[PDB]
Amino acid sequence: GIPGMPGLPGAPGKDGYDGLPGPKG
Amino acid sequence: GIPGMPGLPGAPGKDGYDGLPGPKG
Amino acid sequence: GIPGMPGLPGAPGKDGYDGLPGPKG
Amino acid sequence: GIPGMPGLPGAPGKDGYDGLPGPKG
Amino acid sequence: GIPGMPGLPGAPGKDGYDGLPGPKG
Amino acid sequence: GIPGMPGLPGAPGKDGYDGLPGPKG
Amino acid sequence: PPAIPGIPGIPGTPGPDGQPGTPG
Amino acid sequence: PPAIPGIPGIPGTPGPDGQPGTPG
Amino acid sequence: PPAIPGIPGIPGTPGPDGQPGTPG
Amino acid sequence: PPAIPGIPGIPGTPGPDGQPGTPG
Amino acid sequence: PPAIPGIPGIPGTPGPDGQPGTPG
Amino acid sequence: PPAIPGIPGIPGTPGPDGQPGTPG
Amino acid sequence: APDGKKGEAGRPGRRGRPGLKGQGE
Amino acid sequence: APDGKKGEAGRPGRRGRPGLKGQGE
Amino acid sequence: APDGKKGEAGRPGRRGRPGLKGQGE
Amino acid sequence: APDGKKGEAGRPGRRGRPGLKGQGE
Amino acid sequence: APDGKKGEAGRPGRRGRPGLKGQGE
Amino acid sequence: APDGKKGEAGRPGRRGRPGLKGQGE
């Protein structure tokens, strides 16, 4: 009997980016 | 006799984000 | 019968860089 | 004779954070 | 027949650093 | 005949930190 | 019978961008 | 008997956001 | 017959730079 | 006799925070 | 005959620094 | 005779801090 | 057959930071 | 049976930085 | 032959951030 | 028995940066 | 002999960002 | 004996950035 081999975890996602700041109100 | 195989460590967590700065007091 | 071994995922790409800010209009 | 398998290095620690700047003196 | 084992990719390079800003013109 | 297994590369070093800015001249 | 190994997971998707600023 | 291997750990959770600013 | 293993993927290309600023 | 493998190391602790600012 | 494995690649070199600023 | 494997390299040291600012 | 464990996929990136106010008129 | 060591799960991300004061009125 | 799974290539980096306005004349 | 090498644990994060002066009165 | 694939070396870091203008006289 | 290749140790971190001028008197 020879065992199976496990996998490793996936890398967590890069976050979103900053929304541009507001115009003249 | 054939040995077992060890696993590796989990990746440390991404930190929280900056709380927005205070309003008019 | 001895199984094949799977590969792992490629690292996601480093993002582009900030374009320099506009000249005199 | 079948050899043992070596492990890999641990990831270096994330640094501490900036202490907030001084109050009125 | 026992197969060979493949290697993994090298880590992409850390980018260069910001050149210091210009002197008096 | 059973082959040896290769190792992987070490992680590149975290850079030094910014020297504090000059005093009154 | 001799066993079969597992498969690795994939990286998560990169987040959507933040909402753009206010007026006034 | 021939042995069985271990399993890998998972990444830690991402921290909660900081507390929002003061007044005055 | 005894099986053959898979191969690993490569890192994605680094993005192109952003568009340069406006006038006025 | 057939050999036994090694174990992996763990990530280092995250540094303590910096000292808070001065007065005057 | 039984096969021989491959070797891993190395990290790329760190980029050169940017060009220093302008005058006027 | 059956072969023996290699060992992995270690992370490089973290750089020294930059030189502190000028006067005048 | 002691089969191998599945890995877990990476987690999605968080939202980007939201823009703040434009000019103070 | 010389069984394989368990790995250790990643550590939780620290708090986000806390916001500072809004406007200086 | 239970052959090994192919990995998946990394994803391309996103665009760089786009520059904002130059001077306020 | 040609046993497997132990790995080395990650190194602790450095100090955080220390705050600078508050207001210039 | 089904030999193992070679890996690919990491890619060089890009240029650092170039400095902008000094003082506005 | 087709022995296993040695890995290569990580590269040292670069210098920290050097401080700039203090106050403009």
Numbering used by the authors:
A (entry chain O), B (entry chain P), C (entry chain N), D (entry chain Q), E (entry chain C), F (entry chain R), ...: 6 to 30
G (entry chain E), H (entry chain F), I (entry chain D), J (entry chain G), K (entry chain A), L (entry chain H): 7 to 30
Reported in the publication:
We next attempted to introduce some asymmetry into our structure by increasing the length of peptide B by including 6 more amino acids at its C-terminus from the full length sequence of C1q30 so it could more easily be identified in the density map. This new peptide we call C1q-B ″carrot-top” peptide (B-Crt). Following this, we were able to use this narrow region model as a starting point to build a model for the full C1q collagenous bundle. The full structure of the C1q cys crt assembly revealed a hollow elongated assembly, ∼ 100 Å long and ∼30–50 Å wide depending on the region of the structure. Top-down views of the map revealed the octadecameric nature of the assembly with six copies of the triple helices. At the N-terminal base of the structure there are spokes extending out of the structure, but these were at too low a resolution to resolve the individual chains. Past the spokes the structure is quite narrow and subsequently widens toward the top as shown in Figure 2c. At the narrowest part the three peptide chains in each PPII trimer are nearly parallel to one another and untwisted. As the structure gets wider toward the C-termini, the peptides wrap around each other with a right-handed twist as expected for a canonical collagen triple helix.
One of the of most well-studied defense collagens is complement component 1q (C1q) found in mammalian serum. A key feature of C1q is its “bouquet” structure, containing six flower-like C-terminal globular domains, an intermediate “branching” collagen-like region, and an N-terminal “stem” where the collagen-like portions bundle together. We have recently recapitulated the unique C1q octadecameric structure in a series of short (∼40 amino acids) synthetic peptides derived from the native sequence of the C1q stem region. Here we use a peptide self-assembly system to design collagenous assemblies based on the C1q collagen-like region.
